Ligand binder design. Structure first.
Ligand SMILES: *[C@@H]1O[C@H](CO)[C@@H](O)[C@H](O)[C@H]1NC(C)=O
Ligand SMILES: *[C@@H]1O[C@H](CO)[C@@H](O)[C@H](O)[C@H]1NC(C)=O
Ligand SMILES: *[C@@H]1O[C@H](CO)[C@@H](O)[C@H](O)[C@H]1NC(C)=O
Lengths: 106, 74, 205, 158, 105, 75, 4, 158, 205, 4
């Protein structure tokens, strides 16, 4: 079935990726992902740009003139990563835009 | 004030359960669209220049034409 | 009902006169009228807004339209009546009157000091309301002497498709007087009544 | 091609450079004075002695453009907004020539210079909106330095 | 099978009937984004860290997550001259009207 | 500094036209992949902690497994 | 042809 | 369940509340002192008289958790990072009990309290990373008010 | 080759002694050695890091392992040799030694003034390196008199799973001396050498 | 069962 634009689970396991040779912690985190239909009308929480408002309108009126807008992360949050840096030192650093906080149509 | 988002929320709430593959999609959709049209018309003056409003008005009108939803109706 | 008149033609005679002629198909050859029928000629232009049609009855198949505006496009249509019988208005014909010398002066003569250049003035105006043709130029006359004879005023000729002009090298804290006149292919229009402008002085810092 | 917009209303000015200004600019003032077009306005104090002014006359000169239009002049005043040029015509040049036309806001479509001019009367005064291509809007000679739409108003008028 | 690109999208306000309130422009080029976001994402698609990870995971196992999506990453305004509620002629920058760049998010 | 973007640009430039409907898709792709793997390997230290780099390394290794590209071979 |  | 993280490295402290601090904290100091765990460190001035200090000893007490683990003590010092508790064991309780284990960074997985402890030697000193569930990290008695991971360092130590 | 020994068993005798026993399947009934074969017993624990195996040759099917650490888990495996023939190491058996009284004092005794409470001190320490069993408590002794006999020092008993303690109601601008001892199921360990801490005074505002 |  074709769900509407929603935030869905996405588990990232750095150990499974072999990245524990440089990442110390965390070795896994919840990243989420966005997925689903962007249909007219965009609900307010999909927080469209003016462009997405117009494109969604045009795709509704003529799906051949433009494709629909796309369900993508509209707010993301960082996670703090403890890792071994290029100088072989322990570094704690915020990696921005790692966790989807909200999805929307763009 | 422009209250288009109230109209949209109502329309989305009312049609959120609709699944195009289920047997009564168009009749519930049209009733919903008609209410959405009425709601958007009641905030029209306050919303002039608001792209979300103008897009809603046109999108609704187009859908009601596409789906052959009568102008008046339940 | 009755067949409307045909072949409506506008013959331009002057800046205010146009002769209208038409044919009646219901009529025998040479347009001989042998009954109590009469024609109605209607005309108007689009200037000013919301004008109404002017009308005139004609005993024969021609009518001379007078008191028209110069260099103006008019529309003309004809209808026929015979007691009880009346036709519709014919196909419209158009006719533009000839030019006339402008009959009114340039308007809203405004004189300002140029920003950062107080020895420079900017003259701004509006066209004559009775241009009577394509304005081909303007003449700006200026003087420090309000009582000087017209031939003693400084002349500043200017293009007809512009409504702003700059005059440099003037004396500060001095009254100046300005008059403008329009010109077209027919000649000079009247001069506007003199406008006074005193140039600014220095504000020592 | 990109478009520049100019506006005058109740006066308030929005320049091609998107600077918004409140100008007195009493009497006749050029909004546009370039190679293709002349836009001239008359502003009057709303009450005597007021610094707040409003538009009672709009003059537009569509300069002759060989093969497209002969010179046309449009003029609107308070209580007189015609749907024609001063010569009673509604289009430039011939009957076949539609590069310049007027439609009843009254609108002027000067397709030949990608220019639109909208004129309306709001209460006792006139408003104006101009859409012009950037290269044409900025195409003027050195002496054409007074153009409210390009440079805004003199500091002393604000 | 085209990759993420900025494509033409012409918006005609007059065709939409918005010329009863919009004075100018009555049309503009909005563009739109469309196309595949495939591993590896070229730099100009400017993925977030999240998009980098998601594209990687979808490359390794398309069942684990969908691909990232081609969407506007930079937009620019257009100035619209229009009449507002109070019959005022208004000139306003409408933000985010024109796609300047597309990328994978 | 970290120069993974050059490696990626080269790989994308070299493979963007490739279409599986043509004969030598997989060989040309594997050649480009090996070159991409080599380029990324040579900037490993400078790129430590750059998710673009680490994702490239893993995605390359995974693609080479998926497309059966020998780790050693021509580029 | 006249068109900008 | 949500996780809180604590770190100590070359000293520098990153608290469960994400405040980053540079503390002298010379001698033995509690990082964690709660109902489930004791984390104790020894810090030494890098050179005599220096306010810059670094870690030469890490003691972890995994308190007895009935049915999961008996009490286990881990201790690492500069040049001695074992992969076992002080009693030579690598897991808590029985042979079948794997709720508490050590793997060679040397890591301690206290699954029973959703807690991970990573210990490594960077040069002449020791670093520490702790991942603990928020409700367990904040579960301590009134008298347990000195906990560098919870409240950071005393103002006089910064 | 040669069959490795089987049934390796660790019999705990004390805090430092474990007897190892094993069976040889290659041997005849009653496990009687009737040839020049000898056994090798190997053992180690995981404390401290990187230890190597200790080895010992045995003439018969038993070996007493001495000098082990108290309360420590050891691994044991056996192999057989006969001139040229040598077996592999058997399956490993484990054995944990008994507890002993702690034999070393608590370490890194640190005394600090509590923030905002200068009449309160915080005592922080590290366990004895020779705990020799599960620490069940500590005893903190403190005095204002450095020469007072041990029985005249204030006693502060404390839990064994904590390494920090707070002492309230102390006198300001006063030298205090602190000693700590660990305890386990076997008894008291030695006391740490006294540490001096002078309490702070007031800074009048 | 011991697991948090
Ligand atoms: C034309 O004749 C009719 C009939 O006599 C009359 O009603 C009408 O007013 C006349 N029109 C003019 C312009 O005098
Ligand atoms: C790789 O090998 C596997 C196993 O034979 C096969 O299923 C797959 O189709 C091959 N893919 C390519 C690209 O050669
Ligand atoms: C055991 O015997 C062998 C052979 O004589 C010898 O090489 C080895 O060193 C002995 N091991 C010990 C622990 O003495």
């Amino acid at each position: 079935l074709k769900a509407r634009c929603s935030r869905k689970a996405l588990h990232v396991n750095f150990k499974d990726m072999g990245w524990d040779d440089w990442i110390i912690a965390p070795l896994e985190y919840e990243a989420f992902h966005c997925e689903g239909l962007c249909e007219f009308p965009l609900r307010s929480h999909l927080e469209p740009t003016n462009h997405a408002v117009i494109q969604t309108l045009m795709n509704s009126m003529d799906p051949e003139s433009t494709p629909p807008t796309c369900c993508v992360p509209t707010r993301l949050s960082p996670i703090s990563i403890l890792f071994i840096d290029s100088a072989n030192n322990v570094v704690y650093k915020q990696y921005e835009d790692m966790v989807v906080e909200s999805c929307g149509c763009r | 004030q422009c209250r288009i988002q109230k109209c949209t929320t109502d329309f989305v709430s009312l049609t959120s359960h609709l699944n195009s593959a289920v047997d009564g999609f168009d009749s519930e959709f049209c009733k919903a669209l008609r209410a959405y049209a009425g709601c958007t018309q009641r905030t029209s003056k306050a919303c002039r220049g608001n792209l979300v409003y103008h897009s809603a008005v046109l999108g609704i009108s187009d859908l009601m034409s596409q789906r052959n939803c009568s102008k008046d109706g339940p | 009902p009755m067949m409307p008149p045909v072949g409506v033609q506008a013959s331009i005679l002057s800046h205010d006169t146009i002769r209208i002629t038409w044919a009646d198909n219901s009529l025998p050859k040479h347009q001989k009228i042998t009954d109590s029928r009469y024609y109605t000629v209607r005309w108007k232009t689009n200037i000013p807004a919301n004008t109404k049609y002017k009308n005139a009855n004609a005993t024969t198949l021609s009518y001379l339209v007078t008191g028209l505006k110069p260099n103006t496009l008019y529309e003309f249509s004809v209808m026929v009546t015979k007691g009880r019988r009346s036709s519709t208005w014919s196909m419209t014909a158009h006719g533009a009157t000839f030019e006339l010398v402008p009959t009114s002066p340039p308007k809203d003569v405004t004189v300002v000091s140029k920003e950062g250049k107080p020895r420079t003035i900017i003259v701004n105006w509006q066209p004559p309301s009775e241009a009577n043709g394509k304005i081909t130029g303007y003449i700006i006359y200026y003087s420090t002497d309000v009582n000087a004879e017209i031939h003693d005023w400084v002349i500043e000729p200017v293009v007809g498709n512009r409504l702003t002009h700059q005059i440099q090298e003037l004396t500060l804290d001095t009254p100046y007087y300005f008059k403008i006149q329009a010109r077209n292919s027919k000649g000079m229009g009247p001069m506007s009544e003199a406008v006074q402008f005193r140039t600014p002085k220095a504000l020592g810092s």
